[PDB]
């Protein structure tokens, strides 16, 4: 994607850590919730922010 | 000299390393596999804290490995005529084979 270019071109060198590429570029999130209590504090409603 | 070479000094003291190794192998005979150990030690020393005991491994595991050694997984025997209470999950029995006595 173009977001990969935007995130790499702004590195001081061009080497970005691996655990931030999906964080700031992935186009789909997958949550796994064990019980309703955790569901209420994570994915309540149609929209949520992570 | 152990404290001296431990904290004061900075480089190896292979004379004293050899000395300590000799002392250990003379008073702390050992048998190892991947974490399944057996230790035969002089007892009239460990009763005075001159060598390791079974509480000392508890303390070391506590402050370094960050686990508590419950005193129901580590045993201790006192009559060598019967071998280790358990090693590699096999008990040891002293029986008569032929003319002599063997451990199976």
């Amino acid at each position: 994607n173009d977001a990969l270019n935007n995130i790499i071109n702004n590195a001081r060198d061009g080497c970005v850590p691996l655990n931030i590429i999906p964080l700031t570029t992935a186009a789909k999130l997958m949550v796994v919730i064990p019980d309703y209590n955790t569901y209420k504090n994570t994915c309540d409603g149609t929209t949520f922010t992570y | 000299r152990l404290y001296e070479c431990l904290y004061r000094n900075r480089d190896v003291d292979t004379d004293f390393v050899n000395e300590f190794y000799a002392y250990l192998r003379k008073h702390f005979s050992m048998m190892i596999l991947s974490d399944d150990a057996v230790v035969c030690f002089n007892s009239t020393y460990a009763s005075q804290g001159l060598v390791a005991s079974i509480k000392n491994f508890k303390s070391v595991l506590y402050y370094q490995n960050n686990v508590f050694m419950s005193e129901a997984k580590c045993w201790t025997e006192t009559d060598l005529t019967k071998g280790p209470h358990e090693f590699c999950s096999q008990h040891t029995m002293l029986v008569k084979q032929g003319d002599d006595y063997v451990y199976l």
Binding site: - | Y3, S59, Y63
Partner: protein, 308 residues
């Protein structure tokens, strides 16, 4: 008689309670770090000739602060007098009080310390490094006194365990700030000791839990600007604690204060080579051994151990 108690309190806070018997010493069981010329070790010995008095807070309840007056040697008396006179202006030095009280026919000298804490740092380090649940009363007291827990926590049997009761870390971590303060004040101590021209060897049982330092009985003098502190048992014995109690947790906050948000590092910044050196220069300044932030520059395997 009783005027001894009037002399000890001196000018500050005469709410004395004798914790001994009369004017006689008080035998104890503390963890030293002796190495003179005949004995080494890190074991519990017994009393340094200390008479101890406890200060009363208002409402006549007892508070953790003591006046430990020793009774050892005139030559050591003047020796300590001179070192204290040189070393006084530092904030991390606990206020001595040298006086001369008469017992029977002898102006026996005393060193009446001021506002101490019942347990030093060597006691914490020992009783946490030589753990024994059979008798961990000292750890119990040290835990309850500094508001880390309450006595009712110690009835939940298997409280010390790490596998079960994983909450015990939250009890230990609350001892964080105190240890941090010790480190900081220790650093300042070294600075003073260097700038005054003093040769001295530092130990963990020379430090109340607040951070202060005391009893420089075995020091010597040099020319100013050319002092040396010897920190090789102190730091090294203390090392296994700063990860049990998460001693550096107060370093991801915006200004290293517990009542602030977290520092938000940039997403892509990975080097963290100057931060490590700043942390080293703040906390461990007199660890006279090169610390390479990246181990690729190490010389042999032992230096790799020392930098990892």
């Amino acid at each position: 008689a009783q005027s001894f108690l009037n002399r000890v309190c001196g000018v500050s806070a005469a709410r004395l309670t004798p914790c001994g018997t009369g004017t006689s010493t008080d035998v104890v069981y503390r963890a030293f770090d002796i190495y003179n010329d005949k004995v080494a070790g890190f074991a519990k010995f017994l009393k340094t000739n200390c008479c101890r008095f406890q200060e009363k807070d208002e409402d006549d309840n007892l508070i953790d602060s003591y006046f430990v007056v020793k009774r050892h040697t005139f030559s050591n008396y003047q020796h300590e007098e001179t070192i204290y006179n040189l070393l006084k202006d530092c904030p991390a030095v606990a206020k001595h009080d040298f006086f001369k009280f008469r017992i029977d026919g002898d102006m026996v000298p005393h060193i009446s310390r001021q506002r101490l804490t019942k347990y030093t740092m060597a006691d914490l380090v020992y009783a946490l490094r030589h753990f024994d649940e059979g008798n961990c009363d000292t750890l119990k007291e040290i835990l309850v006194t500094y508001n880390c827990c309450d006595d009712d926590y110690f009835n939940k049997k298997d409280w010390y365990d790490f596998v079960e009761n994983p909450d015990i870390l939250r009890v230990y971590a609350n001892l964080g700030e105190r240890v941090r303060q010790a480190l900081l004040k220790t650093v300042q101590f070294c600075d003073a000791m260097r700038n005054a021209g003093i040769v001295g060897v530092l130990t963990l049982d020379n430090q109340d839990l607040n951070g202060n330092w005391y009893d420089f009985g075995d020091f010597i003098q040099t020319t100013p600007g050319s002092g040396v502190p010897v920190v090789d048992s102190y730091y090294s014995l203390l090392m296994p604690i700063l990860t049990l109690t998460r001693a550096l947790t107060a370093e991801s906050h915006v200004d290293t204060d517990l009542t602030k948000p977290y520092i938000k590092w940039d997403l892509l910044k990975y080097d963290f080579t100057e931060e490590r050196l700043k942390l080293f220069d703040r906390y461990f300044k007199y660890w006279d051994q090169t610390y390479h932030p990246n181990c690729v520059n190490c010389l042999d395997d032992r230096c790799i151990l020392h930098c990892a």
